[PDB]
Nucleic acid binder design. Sequence first.
RNA 1: AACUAGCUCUACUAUC
DNA 2: CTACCGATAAGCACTCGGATAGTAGAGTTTTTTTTTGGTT
DNA 3: ACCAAAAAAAAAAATTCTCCTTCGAGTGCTTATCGGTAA
Lengths: 87, 112, 559, 95, 269, 168, 171
Amino acid sequence: LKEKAIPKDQRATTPYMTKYERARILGTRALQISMNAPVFVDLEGETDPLRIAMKELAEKKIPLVIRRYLPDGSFEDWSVEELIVDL
Amino acid sequence: AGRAALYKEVYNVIASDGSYVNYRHMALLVDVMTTQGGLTSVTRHGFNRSNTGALMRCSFEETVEILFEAGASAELDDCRGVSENVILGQMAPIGTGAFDVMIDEESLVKYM
Amino acid sequence: VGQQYSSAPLRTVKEVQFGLFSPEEVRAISVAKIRFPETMDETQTRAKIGGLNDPRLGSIDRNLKCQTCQEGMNECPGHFGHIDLAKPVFHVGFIAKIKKVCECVCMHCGKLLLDEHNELMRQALAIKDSKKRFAAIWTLCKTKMVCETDVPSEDDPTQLVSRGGCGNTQPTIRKDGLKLVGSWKKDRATGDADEPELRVLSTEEILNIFKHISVKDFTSLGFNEVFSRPEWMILTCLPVPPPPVRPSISFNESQRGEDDLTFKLADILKANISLETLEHNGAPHHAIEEAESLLQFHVATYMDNDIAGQPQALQKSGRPVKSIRARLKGKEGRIRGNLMGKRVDFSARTVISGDPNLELDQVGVPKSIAKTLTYPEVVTPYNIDRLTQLVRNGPNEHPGAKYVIRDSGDRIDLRYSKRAGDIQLQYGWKVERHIMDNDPVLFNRQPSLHKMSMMAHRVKVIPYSTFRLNLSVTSPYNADFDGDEMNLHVPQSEETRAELSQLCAVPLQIVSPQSNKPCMGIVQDTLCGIRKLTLRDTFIELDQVLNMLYWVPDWDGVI
Amino acid sequence: LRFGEMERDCMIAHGAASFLKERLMEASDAFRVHICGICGLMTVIAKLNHNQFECKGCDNKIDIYQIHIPYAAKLLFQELMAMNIPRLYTDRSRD
Amino acid sequence: RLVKALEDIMVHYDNTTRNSLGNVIQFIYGEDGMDAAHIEKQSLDTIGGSDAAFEKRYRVDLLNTDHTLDPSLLESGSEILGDLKLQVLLDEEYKQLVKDRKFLREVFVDGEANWPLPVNIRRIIQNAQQTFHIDHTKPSDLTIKDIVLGVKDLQENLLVLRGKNEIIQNAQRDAVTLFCCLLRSRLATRRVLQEYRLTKQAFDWVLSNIEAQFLRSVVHPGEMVGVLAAQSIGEPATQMTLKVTSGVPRLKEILNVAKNMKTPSLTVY
Amino acid sequence: RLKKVEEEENAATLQLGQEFQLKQINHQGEEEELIALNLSEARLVIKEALVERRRAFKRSQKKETREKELESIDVLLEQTTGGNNKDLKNTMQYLTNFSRFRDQETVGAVIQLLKSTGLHPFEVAQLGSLACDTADEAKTLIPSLNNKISDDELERILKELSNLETLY
Amino acid sequence: MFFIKDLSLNITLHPSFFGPRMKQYLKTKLLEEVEGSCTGKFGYILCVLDYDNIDIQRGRILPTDGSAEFNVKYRAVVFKPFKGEVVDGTVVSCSQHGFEVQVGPMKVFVTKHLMPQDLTFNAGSNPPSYQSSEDVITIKSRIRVKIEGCISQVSSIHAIGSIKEDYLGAI
RNA sequence: AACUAGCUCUACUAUC
DNA sequence: CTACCGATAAGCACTCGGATAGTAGAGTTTTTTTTTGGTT
DNA sequence: ACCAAAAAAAAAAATTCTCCTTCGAGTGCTTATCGGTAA
Ligand SMILES: [Mg+2]
Ligand SMILES: [Mg+2]
Ligand SMILES: [Zn+2]
Ligand SMILES: [Zn+2]
Ligand SMILES: [Zn+2]
């Protein structure tokens, strides 16, 4: 009942961004830049939005933060960059 | 001991031919059946008549009568089950849905 | 582009509450006070009489009333009217529960048999799960057929104080189909002090009793005060559903296509008006009860067709009338055919053959069917050239389009396309075009037995309409090449097509979690060939090895 | 073509929830209605041209929200309370 | 019926397993947290063999002539003899191994060695051997202290429960005990020097690869494992043809008890 | 939800409704009374807000005679984009008329004197309803003014501040 | 009347505006919709408080599209008209049945019968002239009229008050 | 560019 | 001797029954009467 | 004056047995009922 959140310390969630989260972020940015969002990573004349998003993820300048839930109801969050992508 | 024996039996049945499958599946099955203080068969009236969301229950072998019972008891559902979303036509907290997608400003400021 | 935009906030739905209708509020939300049992052609021209069938509710066709909300027909969610009944009637679903309740409460005073002075009902109150305590109370109040007034004898030292309302004795209760009766045996004031009085209970009596129960006793019995109070168990003011649940199909020559339920409603209205006029005049009091029985019968049938089989509720045709329960009953009724599973758009189905040349992840797709389906995008500073080329191409060659969706909801057909070489497609627009190559796509072969039987695929475009795929992926689909078929699905937004390219691509499905060993493989042709090759006693000459080294796409270029 | 139980179940196994929603909604009903949170019911009446959305009976010119649900589901609801039984809200109530 | 019974049940971001009510059914999914993919029929080694064979495979003592190793394997293979620190550490390792042997003999009465486990160690050993042109002649540069520490360090760094309290620590040790015992079995000092011959560089390489793969092997938090299990068990049910009941009727009998067995016979020893 | 009315049709006594709850929650979670200030106090707060956007708009640029104040607020509007905020003007036209004292100094001094007293803002706020300082008219209008305390007590409190103030 | 309190508003941002300047864009937008607001509950919202230090904590991307939603909490200056109160104001519009007083933002309309009897007005035929106590017909023409009926049907507050009561009428 | 195909009732098949 | 459970069985009363496809074929009130307009 | 179409108004609805008929499956809920037993 007390504000149902947590500081960015003492976080018990895994430090590895999971494949579901990967696909979600990729699709979200694909739709985002798809309908003319501001782009951040320099293009190479590559037209496909989804591959642009993948290049952004590899280059790691994604301006997103990921929300995270626990069965109790209290939530937790992360920023994309502090996660590490391996999968 | 009951769950142990039941797992043994079902593993025997499956391994009788065309074996096999990983132990974890059977373990999960026997447990989710037995975590009730007893045991319950998977019938129209074994597990379905148990404290659980309304719609997902009514989506199996018990069409309307269950709704009547719900309305009479006037209970409520929080719709955190997959069915409840599906009937409700909203993204259920599944896979990609198991988390929210949140936005930040400060990173946007930092990298312009 | 806005579906007739509404300036109202939108939000998801997080919670659903279940309950009954209190008669007063359902009457409040009503719009019609339906009297006439006729439906259409007043005297008898057009413009359905202000009885049934929109006095002031859901429109009919091309007349945008919507109860004068002008919200066409597609927008019209419907509106409700209400009907009135001379006498209270039961509710077939709500019969066993009401019987248990009646046994549980002491009529003629409107009180509980058991009250917090024995331990037993106290523990029953203690077990507050939701409902089981109701069963406990029911099985504890089966006995004590007589209402008491001074129960507590030994909790207090020897005395006894007053808690009971009446000194009367509650008759035993039974039911016969649509009706229930009480048995006043009572061991006194009866036939030879033993022969009981068999009296059929009057509904309204029960309903008065039901009001007289105290509020907390509902909680005791599990009724939620604000949402389900027992007196609402009985039906008094039956609500009326709107038109869009009872269409007028007009089956193919000139019929009116009147549904089963609307005839049922007309019949019940006839019953109501008949009972009203009968009782209003000199009631002989030997037919009014029959009118009551008939009216309850009709409402019962309308609420449900399939009570214990003493009646059948046959229609005026011979097939039995069809009610709500039958309408939405399981197995293709309104849930498993119309809610949980559906017919979708953007799909195709055909027969298939092998291909020893297409790579594993793609799928052979037929040029014509490729033109048939479509897919929208959004106009970008990146896609403008290609999109322009396609819309120039037209809807009658592969790399083409079929619709242009601009900023506003302006569907522009390219089949007519009186201005083909005109449009220039400024930014932020949507263009539905054909399926070019390397597009994500869903492939599936019902029945589905495991995680596989449906994965993603890239797309090649092939003549000779059929489907083509790789021999390797065969076994997981468990499909032949004799005459079998699969099903095709195509995403509709960038989000989804992305969502498929990372969790359903057959590259990502090599190892089956089901049996912790790969579900892929190679099959009879290639297997036999490799065995006939990779054995010591064979060899090869110069030409063929060169052709082989050229065959492998990933050849380094070294002999 | 028909989308069936087991197909949906396999989708669930994959977990492509967003694709599930899109395929089940846009290839299908994709209907929109407003409700009265005070009602929790399916009964509000609107005047798009007049920008009025009042729920008569609940006489509230504020408690208005629009929800995207499948036409089939709302249908279900009409016969459901026509069967005389279902409130709806738009937020938690127990935490 | 099966698929309609375990829809909601799944794994949340606490490595736990709840229905759509929050009821826990598996505190750790599969009691391992290892995804169903990352399993091989890898071969355990400690359980098998005879006591003498086990001793010869693992026992080693510098101060004794019998189980001592040849100095030629180690660059510092001669002067290493005599130190009390090294002998003490080796004895501690041997005690750990024999305790593990007792444990495994307890867990499996049959003693069958092959079992389904997370990430393999064999393959990485072979490819490490290849990736450095390791020969059969040169001695080994890495020292005993190196490996005897690194083994514990690696088994410690493996993490499945990102916790901080006591109970989580207990479970985390518990949840990985079999894998750590197996790893200890495969990475015996005697085995390493006498057959594996690894260099210190390659040793660090394999340690890092082991850790990376193990982290790769965690269950992805957020899949609907219950549906997967149900559909998986269902699949073979159809694909099967056929004085003791068996087959699909028996399957239904257990799955739907139905207190009537027709073969209720029982076994007595 | 059974209509959850808990409301009363507004009266001269200002009977507070549920949605105008007497004790209101806060985002931080503190519980406090329904924040209301008299006709006098609001005007200076508005002036402070206006001068705050004055600094904010001189920051945006580098990228007592009510009419000039209206045009100044208009300038606040057009510094961002062309001002069509007519209703804000018309209310602001009456905003100085909301304030009991027209001159800035008189209303301000009334505020600093009342803040020490801690008197209910309703009592002094009822003053500016009509252009009248005679109390008898207000006592006739609002009986609760007589009921809560007699008139003469009202003026023995009032004359401490009415001396500095000059009405419209 | 003068109630100042923190208010929460839901704001949807189109994704194309996802630039580092968005915070300024959000502040500007909130300025347009909030200022001059006239809601049924709070009456008409006249201006915000403490323009800087408003909390914009974070935002949720809509699942269907790039639209992002933000919930913001801000203190503001708002007036709430209340019934039973007497306000003098300009007679902007003149009608034969009864003079219509515009009390600043909100409007007051009164008929001939509501008109006070102690202060006899010739209001039936036309807007009342100069008579017994005092009454005027000009554009400024402030007339003391009560408020007894508040209507929030439209995006504004309309007030009606009977004038046949103790001390009601122009003086 | 005038905007709709369309219900149930039994028989036969198609893969599995 | 006497209600006081009570466990046992008998009954009786329940509702359930693979996934898709594609056909084509017949009938979706009946009879009786009265009325009145087409007819010669 | 003849009559024919058609629309409107009412009911054909009785033979008889329980055969319905094989769907039998189980399971759960109700009810009789000997049967014992402590006061
Ligand atoms: Mg529940
Ligand atoms: Mg075949
Ligand atoms: Zn309407
Ligand atoms: Zn009584
Ligand atoms: Zn309402």
